[PDB]
Design a protein around this ligand. Sequence first.
Ligand SMILES: [N]C1=N[C]=NC2=C1N=[C]N2[C]1O[C]([C]OP(=O)(=O)OP(=O)(=O)[C]P(=O)(=O)O[C]2[C]([O])[C]([O])[C]([O])[C]([O])[C]2[O])[C]([O])[C]1[O]
Length: 446
Amino acid sequence: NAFLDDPEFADIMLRAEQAIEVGIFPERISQGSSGSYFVKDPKRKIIGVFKPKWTKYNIFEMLRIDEGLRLKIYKDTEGYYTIGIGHLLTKSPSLNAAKSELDKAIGRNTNGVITKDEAEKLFNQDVDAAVRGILRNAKLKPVYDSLDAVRRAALINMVFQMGETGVAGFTNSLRMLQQKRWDEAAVNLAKSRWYNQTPNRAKRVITTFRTGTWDAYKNLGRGCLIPNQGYLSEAGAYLVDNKLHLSIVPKTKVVWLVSETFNYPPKIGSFQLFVEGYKEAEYWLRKFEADPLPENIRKQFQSQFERLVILDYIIRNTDRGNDNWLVRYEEFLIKIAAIDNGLAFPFKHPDEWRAYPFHWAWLPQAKVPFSEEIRNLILPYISDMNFVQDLCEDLYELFKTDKGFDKATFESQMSVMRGQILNLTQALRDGKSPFQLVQIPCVIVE
Ligand SMILES: [N]C1=N[C]=NC2=C1N=[C]N2[C]1O[C]([C]OP(=O)(=O)OP(=O)(=O)[C]P(=O)(=O)O[C]2[C]([O])[C]([O])[C]([O])[C]([O])[C]2[O])[C]([O])[C]1[O]
């Protein structure tokens, strides 16, 4: 825990270590979670927040992903009774009717509950039925016979989801598939009620038709964040703040601490300075409805808000609510503290079924254009490519400390961050607002 460049932070860490020696241990902020502690000095005053650090692809795995697995009767998108892996029981609203149909299919009285093996058994039968529907159909079989195995699975997937008759209705798209006009068929298949009802699944199936690959099913659930590196994200947010002189992130560094209260020998983690007298932003936003800020303080609050927008956009924070940016209100008359920055610096921009929006973008303040004050203060930095390169190198030195560091994954993080900086640069030049800034389509700098 050497902080030669920051003696003030080192003394704070020394006070933390001294308190531990006299038995004053950090306490969990929430009793349920062991990843966040309030660190106290020898006078039991809180000084900081410490946060310690073969798959086979085929129609079956394709449909397991698209349909899920439920062992108890549930309602589908239309509200129809369903169980297992996308097995429709009946269109009747009667739950007893669904249980009646389920009992016939299983061979025993289930009362709406089956086992995984029974769910798989129905799943195999349903897939075979879908293949039978394809082969017995004069419009599906010629398409099926002409397709490779991967694209055949996409055809089976559609017949599974909507039935033989429904898929047979795609007269022109089926012909395009048979003629191997993948791009034309993919475009034409999107203009369907099927796509609108289930857009995420239809996009996966259409991509399978377009490419003949499993790429739409390979990296699902990976997320956009490197695992087990939140402590570096916390430290990286302060680094970005400090280089831009935003002064809204409390000083946060990677430190090592040993404590009996930890869940198990030093533990690495992020140490963020505790700030006192701050309330959640949602609290003060609520209070300003009855007591709106005087114009001098409103301008000061908006400039602080712009700094928060700049920080979050640059680091592409995925976990900013209006509860985890704090506001102090009674030099600065009103101040913002950007805390809890452990889920930033994603290695890729998020997909659009899980957008991870900035929750301050909903606020009316976000429609206020960036002030000329913030633009003149920030544009000289972010428009300077030497500055941007130095920032990336600073983050490299910090991020490479972790054992799981990967050069390719890190350069992905910087490409996302450089892309964010580019869009922010243009938005400031255009005099846009934080609300308009987050509308710009995401870009990367390769
Ligand atoms: N610098 C600072 N100065 C002053 N006050 C600070 C401060 N920093 C923070 N506070 C305060 O301390 C609270 C918690 O600080 P925090 O960062 O939110 O920690 P936290 O562990 O993430 C919480 P959690 O319930 O989400 O814990 C969950 C788990 O339970 C699990 O479910 C998973 O989701 C995750 O492992 C985990 O996020 C904040 O609200 C603030 O009032």
